[PDB]
Structure 1
Amino acid sequence: MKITSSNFATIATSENFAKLSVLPKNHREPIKGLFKSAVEQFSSARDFFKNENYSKELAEKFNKEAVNEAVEKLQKAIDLAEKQGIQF
């Protein structure tokens, strides 16, 4: 049975974790900590991955806002100068 990041949430299930309670404690607790470490790490990666995209989305908007004001100041400048006879 092979685990990939596409099938991870299918195996990391409460049902497989409960299947682990029949084992004796020497085996049960190391495997359980292994199971729980994998889930919390997978969830931190998912949490981190989607907030970074959110930030990027925001940042792109911000960038776009800045770029357009800059184009309108150049435009303004240029237009003001043509009125004063400047031959661009």
Structure 2
Amino acid sequence: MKITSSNFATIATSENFAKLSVLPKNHREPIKGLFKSAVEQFSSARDFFKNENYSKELAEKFNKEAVNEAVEKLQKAIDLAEKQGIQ
């Protein structure tokens, strides 16, 4: 459905990923790629604080980027899957 910052982890489950594996090659790969990338960018959205090279204000801006862009990446993967038969 509509992916937000909070409910990101409730759609980006491993069950949906394993359900996305029955698509044809020309469609599965672009969708599974947008799925893993959204998870990677989101699963490490707080890693900007583990390093002392970024100020708190700066790492805050990189956190918003690593969340808002990863939600968009997950939305496209779900939207394309909805256009497909996975829905």
Bin for the TM-score computed over the shorter chain: 0.5 to 0.7
CA shift in 2, pair 1:50/1:20, >3 Å: same
More displaced, 10-19 or 51-60? 51-60
SS in 1 for 2:6: coil
Match of 1:75?
75
Give me the TM-score of the superposition, normalised by structure 1: 0.54
Q: Hey, which of these two has a bigger chunk of helix by percent?
A: 1
Please, which runs of 5 or more residues in structure 1 have no aligned partner? none
Alpha-carbon shift at residue 43 of structure 1 (Å): 1.4
Aligned-residue Cα RMSD (Å) equals 27.1
Alignment CA distance shift 1:12-1:46 (3 Å)? farther
The structure having more radius of gyration, on CA atoms, is 1
Shift of 1:46: 2.9
How many Å apart are 1:65 and its aligned residue?
Answer: 34
Change (3 A) 1:21 1:55: same
1:84 CA drift (Å): 87
Matched, 1:85 2:85: yes
Amino-acid identity (%)? 100
- Aligned residue-pair number: 87
Higher relative contact order (CA 8 A, sep 6+): 2
Shift of residue 47, structure 1, vs aligned partner: 2.9
Pairwise CA distance, 1:44: 1.9
1:45 alignment partner, SS class: coil
